[PDB]
Design a protein around this ligand. Structure first.
Ligand SMILES: Nc1ccn([C@H]2C[C@H](O)[C@@H](COP(=O)(O)OP(=O)(O)OP(=O)(O)O)O2)c(=O)n1
Ligand SMILES: [Zn+2]
Ligand SMILES: [Zn+2]
Ligand SMILES: [Zn+2]
Ligand SMILES: [Zn+2]
Length: 353
């Protein structure tokens, strides 16, 4: 019996149902853009469960016993079985609002509000937005437009590893005992990503040393002429608060200049702009941060839902709290968090939910 929770399923990059999941992912994305959170969630859960299957769906009988497959989702599956296409997903791909929202939000610094504003002003292309003399852009959007082609090109593993070298080199200059771990999609085994994420922690650094590292590292890169964009969010983390966007570790959203000579791959300007996110956490919370920043987004949503609805526990990126025992549960590894929750350990490459 397949569980309704992604944290109780093994989801590897071996997807046998991409014909169904690509359609469900488009319908979920459109519902996100149309601010229909409920319908978005239903399509995301259905797409997630199909991604976990060890076989391709070839008839409606194959869907019997599979959870998170409502009547609307089953109608979409039935239509794809019929002629290999989703008429619903095809209509979304051709919708002018969907196309504009995908195109505008593909710019670093442009969210739902700005995309909607530009669409209602009558804009349909990035060329017409960029050349407009009345529009005002944020510093994030300026960088988003200036390095657009590099940021819309996917980051591959040789590039991610070249970025890892730069991060490690900079960090150990100021904190030589620091541990730097690549998180996100690349930690789950992905060949490509939109950015490169890292978790930084130090077993001996003080509260102030921990605070100053991201400032020292980014100033070093600014001096080297490698810092193309930088936004540092100070920590809002509270050591003794109970475990959605307001509480967080110190982090920074960057754009780094990656020289081609640093990339060791089999293969213009001689450099590429790369989106990099750095997260600094206290040493004792490193397992919770690692689990949260490894993802996938759906795996994280189901982990938190399972903890709350099944084990009356409260989980987030900073801690695990037991509401029955009225105590915070400690962990030195992800394995210990899974054991506290009563879950079999799911490897990072099996969290592609
Ligand atoms: N406020 C935030 C930001 C990020 N994350 C985590 C969970 C995600 O898996 C990942 C989200 O940022 P990304 O979209 O870069 O993660 P990926 O590396 O998985 O995305 P992609 O492969 O699409 O580049 O890190 C989080 O928990 N909370
Ligand atoms: Zn990423
Ligand atoms: Zn990121
Ligand atoms: Zn928290
Ligand atoms: Zn080489």
């Amino acid at each position: 019996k397949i569980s309704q929770y992604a944290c109780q399923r093994r989801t590897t990059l071996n997807n046998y149902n991409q014909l169904f999941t690509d359609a469900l992912d488009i319908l979920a994305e459109n519902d996100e853009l149309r601010e229909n959170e409920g319908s978005c969630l239903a399509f995301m859960r259905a797409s997630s469960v199909l991604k976990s299957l060890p076989f391709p769906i070839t008839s409606m009988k194959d869907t019997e016993g599979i959870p998170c497959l409502g009547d609307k989702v089953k109608s979409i599956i039935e239509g794809i079985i019929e002629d290999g296409e989703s008429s619903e997903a095809k209509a979304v791909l051709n919708d002018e609002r969907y196309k504009s929202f995908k195109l505008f939000t593909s710019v670093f610094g442009v969210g739902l509000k700005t995309a909607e504003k530009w669409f209602r002003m009558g804009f349909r292309t990035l060329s017409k937005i960029q050349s407009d003399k009345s529009l005002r852009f944020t510093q994030m959007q300026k960088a988003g437009f200036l390095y657009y082609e590099d940021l819309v090109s996917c980051v591959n593993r040789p590039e991610a590893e070249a970025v890892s070298m730069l991060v490690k080199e900079a960090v150990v200059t100021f904190l030589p005992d620091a541990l730097v771990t690549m998180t996100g999609g690349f930690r789950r085994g992905k060949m490509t990503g939109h950015d490169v994420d890292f978790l930084i922690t130090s077993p001996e650094a003080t509260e102030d040393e921990e605070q100053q590292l991201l400032h020292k590292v980014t100033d070093f890169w600014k001096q080297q002429g490698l810092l193309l964009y930088c936004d540092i969010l100070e920590s809002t983390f509270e050591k003794f608060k109970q475990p959605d966007a307001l509480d967080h570790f110190q982090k920074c959203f960057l754009i780094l200049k990656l020289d081609h000579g640093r990339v060791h791959s089999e293969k213009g300007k001689g450099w590429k702009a790369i989106r990099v996110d750095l997260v600094m956490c206290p040493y004792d919370r490193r397992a919770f941060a690692l689990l949260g920043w490894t993802g996938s987004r759906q795996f994280e949503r189901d982990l938190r839902r399972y903890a709350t609805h099944e084990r009356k526990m409260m989980l987030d990126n900073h801690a695990l709290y037991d509401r029955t025992k009225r105590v915070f549960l400690e962990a030195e590894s992800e394995e210990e968090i899974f054991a506290h929750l009563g879950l079999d350990y799911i490897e990072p490459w099996e969290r592609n939910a």
